[PDB]
C-alpha cells in the first residue's frame, strides 16, 4: 500500500529514535571534545531552515504544509543517527581505540550527511523538490557535499538499488556541472594549489579534495567517452587521443569549465580530434550518439555558455571559444599521450 | 581550418 521506496525507508528506521543511541552516545563520551551539542545544534538549525523553505510558496516551487515537513525531518534525523552510528563504529580510529574528537567536529560532514539523508526521504516520497533544492536551501557547496555520497552507500546497505542509482546520479550532476559554478570552492582549492590542475597519472595512478574530485571527474569522463567511442564505432587508438585533448582542456584551459558541462568539452574534443586525424564523425552523428546516455538532455548542446551574458549552441562554442583555445595542441597530431583508466 | 560549417537544427 506504500511504494517499494517509502516501504524500505520505514523498515530502515524501525524502532530507532530521532536521537543518538546509547552506543553513538558512548563514542561521543569517549572523546575529549564530546561533540553531542554541536551536532544537536546543526540539526536544529538545518531543520528550522528546512521547514522555513519547505513551507514558503516561491513562484518556482509551490509551498506545502508544516505537518509533512516535520515528518520528512524526523525521518532524515532517525537515518542520520543510524548512519552516524554505523560510520563512527566502522571508523578504523574507533577500531584502534583512538580519540575521534577531530572526525566528529567537522561540521561540513554533519551538514552534508543530514542533507544527503534529507534528499533520501524527498527522493523516496517522489518529492516535487528535485536535487539540488536541498543543498541550495541549506547553503551547501556541492564540491564538499559529493564526498558524503560514497560514505552513505557503504554505511547503509538496506538502501534499494533505486536509492543508490539516485545517489550516484546526483554525485554525477555535481562532477559534470554544479561544482564548476563561478561560486564553487573548487576555484579556491585550485588557487591554494598555485592553480595546478591534477593530471590522470597523479590521481588515477597526490591526495586531498582536489585529487579526489578530479579522480571522480576523470572517471566519469572516461566512462562517457568509452560509451560514445563504442556507439560511434571509432578506434581505441584515436579514443586515446580524444582523452588527451579532454585532459588538455581540463588542465591547460580549466576556466573553459566555469559555469559549464563536462560533456560540452568532451564532445568538442571528439570532433576536433576525429578531424585532425583522417577519421571524421560530425557534431550531429555525435549529438545523436551522445543523445542516448542517461545524463544527456538538449540544453547541454543546445544552450551552451559563450559570454560572462550570451548563451547558444554547442557548434557556436566550438567555433567562437574552443577552436582558438585548443587548435595549437590538437594540430600537433596530423606528441605524447595520457593514460585511459580501467 | 578545423571549424564546423554544420548548422544544428533538430
Amino acid at each position: 500500500e506504500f511504494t517499494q521506496s517509502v516501504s524500505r525507508l520505514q523498515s530502515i528506521v524501525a524502532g530507532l529514535k530521532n536521537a543518538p543511541s546509547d552506543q553513538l552516545i558512548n563514542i561521543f563520551e569517549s572523546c575529549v571534545r564530546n561533540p553531542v551539542e554541536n551536532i544537536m545544534k546543526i540539526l536544529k538549525g538545518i531543520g528550522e531552515t528546512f521547514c522555513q523553505h519547505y513551507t514558503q510558496s516561491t513562484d518556482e516551487q509551490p509551498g506545502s504544509h508544516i505537518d509533512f515537513a516535520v515528518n520528512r525531518l524526523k525521518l532524515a534525523e532517525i537515518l542520520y543517527y543510524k548512519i552516524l552510528e554505523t560510520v563512527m563504529v566502522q571508523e578504523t580510529r574507533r577500531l584502534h581505540g583512538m580519540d575521534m574528537s577531530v572526525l566528529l567536529e567537522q561540521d561540513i560532514f554533519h551538514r552534508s550527511l543530514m542533507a544527503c539523508c534529507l534528499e533520501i526521504v524527498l527522493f523516496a516520497y517522489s518529492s516535487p523538490r528535485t536535487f539540488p533544492w536541498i543543498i541550495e536551501v541549506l547553503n551547501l557547496q556541492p564540491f564538499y557535499f559529493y564526498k558524503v555520497i560514497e560514505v552513505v552507500i557503504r554505511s547503509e546497505e538496506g538502501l534499494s538499488r533505486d536509492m543508490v542509482k539516485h545517489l550516484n546520479s546526483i554525485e554525477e550532476q555535481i562532477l559534470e556541472s554544479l561544482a564548476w559554478s563561478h561560486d564553487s570552492a573548487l576555484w579556491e582549492a585550485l588557487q591554494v594549489s598555485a592553480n595546478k590542475v591534477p593530471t590522470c597519472e597523479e590521481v588515477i595512478f597526490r591526495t586531498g579534495s582536489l585529487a579526489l574530485f578530479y579522480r571522480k571527474v576523470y572517471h566519469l569522463a572516461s566512462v562517457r567517452l568509452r560509451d560514445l567511442c563504442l556507439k560511434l564505432d571509432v578506434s581505441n587508438e584515436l579514443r586515446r587521443k580524444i582523452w588527451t585533448c579532454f585532459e588538455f582542456t581540463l588542465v591547460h584551459c580549466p576556466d573553459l569549465m566555469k559555469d559549464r558541462h563536462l560533456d560540452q568539452l568532451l564532445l568538442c574534443a571528439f570532433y576536433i580530434m576525429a578531424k585532425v586525424t583522417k577519421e571524421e564523425r560530425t557534431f550531429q552523428e555525435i549529438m545523436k550518439s551522445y543523445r542516448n546516455q542517461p545524463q544527456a538532455n538538449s540544453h547541454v548542446y543546445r544552450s551552451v555558455l559563450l559570454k560572462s551574458e550570451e548563451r547558444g549552441d554547442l557548434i557556436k562554442f566550438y567555433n567562437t571559444i574552443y577552436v582558438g583555445r585548443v587548435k595549437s595542441f590538437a594540430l600537433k597530431y596530423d606528441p605524447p599521450l595520457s593514460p585511459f583508466p580501467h | 581550418d578545423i571549424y564546423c560549417y554544420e548548422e544544428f537544427s533538430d
Side-chain angles (χ1 to χ4, degrees), chain A residues 1-16 18-160 162-230 232-240 242-277 279-306 309-342, chain B:
Chain A
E1 188 218 291
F2 298 93
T3 38
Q4 216 192 352
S5 324
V6 167
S7 267
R8 186 65 78 99
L9 219 48
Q10 303 162 240
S11 75
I12 283 185
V13 292
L16 295 179
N18 68 318
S21 98
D22 284 11
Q23 153 84 240
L24 191 44
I25 286 175
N26 270 340
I27 273 163
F28 282 172
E29 261 146 30
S30 92
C31 296
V32 183
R33 304 163 232 129
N34 170 323
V36 77
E37 210 156 279
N38 321 66
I39 284 166
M40 179 59 245
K41 288 204 195 89
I42 290 176
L43 251 53
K44 214 212 221 283
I46 286 170
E48 276 142 53
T49 305
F50 175 63
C51 288
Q52 282 152 223
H53 286 59
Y54 185 92
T55 65
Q56 264 182 67
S57 324
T58 166
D59 311 280
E60 216 171 69
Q61 179 41 52
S64 321
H65 201 306
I66 188 65
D67 269 3
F68 293 116
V70 200
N71 169 301
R72 314 291 216 266
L73 194 77
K74 204 212 231 283
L75 261 163
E77 288 169 356
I78 306 172
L79 271 153
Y80 174 72
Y81 282 124
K82 181 202 198 311
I83 302 174
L84 198 65
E85 175 172 331
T86 310
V87 163
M88 281 345 278
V89 169
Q90 300 205 322
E91 191 61 278
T92 73
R93 255 194 93 84
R94 202 285 312 176
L95 288 147
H96 282 108
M98 271 135 78
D99 177 291
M100 283 187 281
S101 298
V102 162
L103 293 172
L104 277 155
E105 75 193 349
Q106 305 319 308
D107 309 330
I108 191 48
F109 162 73
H110 289 302
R111 295 177 52 207
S112 42
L113 180 57
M114 181 62 186
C116 194
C117 280
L118 261 163
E119 173 63 4
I120 280 184
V121 168
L122 286 185
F123 180 62
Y125 275 103
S126 288
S127 175
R129 311 180 144 82
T130 300
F131 194 74
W133 179 94
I134 199 54
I135 68 173
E136 276 146 18
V137 161
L138 290 177
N139 301 66
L140 272 178
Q141 272 282 344
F143 178 71
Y144 286 142
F145 170 88
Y146 93 97
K147 254 172 41 203
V148 84
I149 291 152
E150 31 176 300
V151 165
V152 172
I153 304 155
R154 260 138 67 171
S155 293
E156 196 45 51
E157 275 196 309
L159 231 53
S160 52
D162 303 47
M163 281 145 168
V164 163
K165 177 199 283 323
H166 178 85
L167 287 189
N168 291 321
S169 99
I170 55 175
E171 192 188 268
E172 293 171 45
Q173 279 182 248
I174 299 188
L175 306 154
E176 72 188 7
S177 56
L178 250 65
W180 310 81
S181 177
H182 59 270
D183 56 70
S184 193
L186 151 73
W187 308 119
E188 307 187 350
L190 258 173
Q191 213 179 247
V192 298
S193 297
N195 281 342
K196 211 146 165 279
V197 167
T199 88
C200 205
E201 297 91 291
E202 319 166 320
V203 300
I204 283 308
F205 296 92
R206 334 181 331 181
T207 185
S209 55
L210 241 193
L212 192 56
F213 180 72
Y214 277 88
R215 204 181 141 291
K216 298 217 147 229
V217 156
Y218 279 148
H219 172 74
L220 197 54
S222 46
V223 168
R224 282 152 176 206
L225 177 62
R226 274 205 105 119
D227 300 346
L228 256 167
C229 283
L230 251 68
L232 286 172
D233 215 285
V234 296
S235 324
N236 274 313
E237 300 73 39
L238 157 78
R239 141 174 133 180
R240 244 151 191 91
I242 297 161
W243 181 248
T244 88
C245 195
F246 176 81
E247 199 178 59
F248 163 78
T249 76
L250 291 213
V251 161
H252 304 284
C253 314
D255 60 289
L256 267 163
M257 275 297 324
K258 197 169 296 189
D259 286 306
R260 295 219 168 89
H261 213 291
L262 216 52
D263 289 9
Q264 295 165 331
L265 266 85
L266 182 65
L267 282 200
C268 266
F270 210 122
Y271 183 72
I272 196 165
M273 289 306 263
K275 244 192 161 43
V276 304
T277 56
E279 192 169 4
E280 285 81 309
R281 294 308 176 287
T282 205
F283 256 102
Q284 300 252 201
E285 281 126 38
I286 304 155
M287 147 193 186
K288 279 287 141 162
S289 276
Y290 170 78
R291 204 161 141 121
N292 267 49
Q293 310 200 1
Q295 87 270 21
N297 263 263
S298 324
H299 72 79
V300 172
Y301 61 104
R302 298 216 296 239
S303 186
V304 184
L305 189 76
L306 310 165
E309 173 180 329
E310 221 156 0
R311 302 187 68 97
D313 172 90
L314 182 44
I315 305 164
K316 194 132 171 243
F317 168 67
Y318 178 68
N319 298 326
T320 310
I321 300 127
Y322 201 84
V323 169
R325 294 225 55 209
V326 190
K327 144 192 261 193
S328 154
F329 165 91
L331 278 171
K332 266 160 227 184
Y333 297 85
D334 223 308
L337 292 192
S338 209
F340 206 88
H342 201 53
Chain B
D1 43 288
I2 38 174
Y3 285 79
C4 202
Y5 303 102
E6 234 177 343
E7 321 256 340
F8 264 140
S9 45
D10 263 298

